[PDB]
């Protein structure tokens with residue numbers, strides 16, 4: 001099939017407004033856009049949670065078939081989870097001029113004590129584009145999982161790939177970045193082990 | 198050093214306050230809380246801004262006879278700044294109101310967003326979209342559909358092969374969390390799913 005029909009030049013962002021500015025922002029976009037029927041929308045407003053964008057690293061040890069996870073509290077999980085302490089990927093915000101790879105390698109070293117060898121891109125995704133602009137770009141990084149060490153009150157975990165994926169299936173890992181990375185690993189680990197040996 | 202799998206509760210968190218920062222269509226709250234530390238003791242009072250927009254039900258519409266998936270296309274303006282286009286190919290989805298089940302919402306949105314009656318369902322998974330800054334949880338089901346009944350009922354409905362939809366995930370043409378998660382799951386499970394549903 002065709003895939004999507006329209007691009008940026010088919011929408012006019014009339015103006016934006018910051019409704020709240022603190023650590024993060026809440027912005028109001030005012031815009032018009034082309035309709036699938038040909039016409040041009042009326043003026044539309046949407047509230048958009050703006051918090052910058054992130055780099056994510058899945059630390060994979062291809063020799064051991066293990067991943068490294070980081071555990072820490074995410075208070076926003078409280079209301080819909082049995083515990084707000086989550087098992088997650090290495091991640092960090094991307095500041096201006098930084099690259100995904102730079103941030104990913106830096107965070108693996110200081111959150112988990114991991115020197116990263118080769119990296120490969122996994123996927124870059126929008127976390128929830130109806131309400132937030134946030135994009136997260138995921139890499140897989142080559143590590144020796146036996147060297148993992150924890151140093152922002154964080155506990156470092158080493159688990160087999162198979163157990164980490166079973167925990168996705170069971171709901172014990174249930175944050176988007178980790179689910180997406182570990183599903184991708186379940187689809188690609190044979191090729192990745194072949195490539196990284 | 199690290200905790201190897203082969204070798205805290207909510208009583209360990211004190212939510213002191215939730216302070217309203219913004220109330221409009223969505224909400225922004227300041228959570229003020231304390232929590233137990235891995236090395237013992239409690240943290241001091243910590244504050245976090247949290248985007249509150251409720252929770253959602255997501256349905257991956259899968260025709261197992263035809264090995265096809267139904268996608269819905271619509272503009273998501275928050276995608277603008279980082280995407281080639283703000284029109285996104287997505288799963289059927291809708292907010293869960295109080296007292297509604299994931300299954301009720303998923304089946305309703307499928308019918309109204311895409312004209313699909315849904316047969317059997319299976320859970321895929323339920324995930325937190327971005328738990329450092331938002332409480333939003335999305336619960337995905339796979340739904341059995343007859344893809345030759347999909348019709349747009351501003352939204353455009355696409356019917357594509359599963360292999361095409363998954364190739365679009367690989368290429369980045371589908372890159373929203375819900376659709377990526379659903380379609381990666383389908384790629385891991387379609388062989389057994391198709392057999393169970395035929």
Ligand SMILES: Nc1ncnc2c1ncn2[C@@H]1O[C@H](COP(=O)(O)OP(=O)(O)O)[C@@H](O)[C@H]1O
Pocket residue numbers: 045046047048130131222223290291292
């Ligand atoms: N980001 C937003 N800001 C303000 N209103 C919104 C926003 N997103 C959705 N809405 C409101 O909710 C309705 C449903 O929009 P849609 O995004 O298609 O559903 P959902 O948000 O449940 O996925 C719209 O008519 C709109 O008025």
Ligand SMILES: Nc1ncnc2c1ncn2[C@@H]1O[C@H](COP(=O)(O)OP(=O)(O)O)[C@@H](O)[C@H]1O
Pocket residue numbers: 023072073152153244245246247329330
């Ligand atoms: N939702 C938020 N509200 C307020 N501040 C935040 C939020 N998320 C991150 N920060 C700030 O960014 C810093 C690093 O964030 P991160 O490492 O992701 O979370 P934390 O270290 O608090 O578990 C924190 O010290 C905190 O001040």
Ligand SMILES: [Mg+2]
Pocket residue numbers: 091092093107
């Ligand atoms: Mg970080």
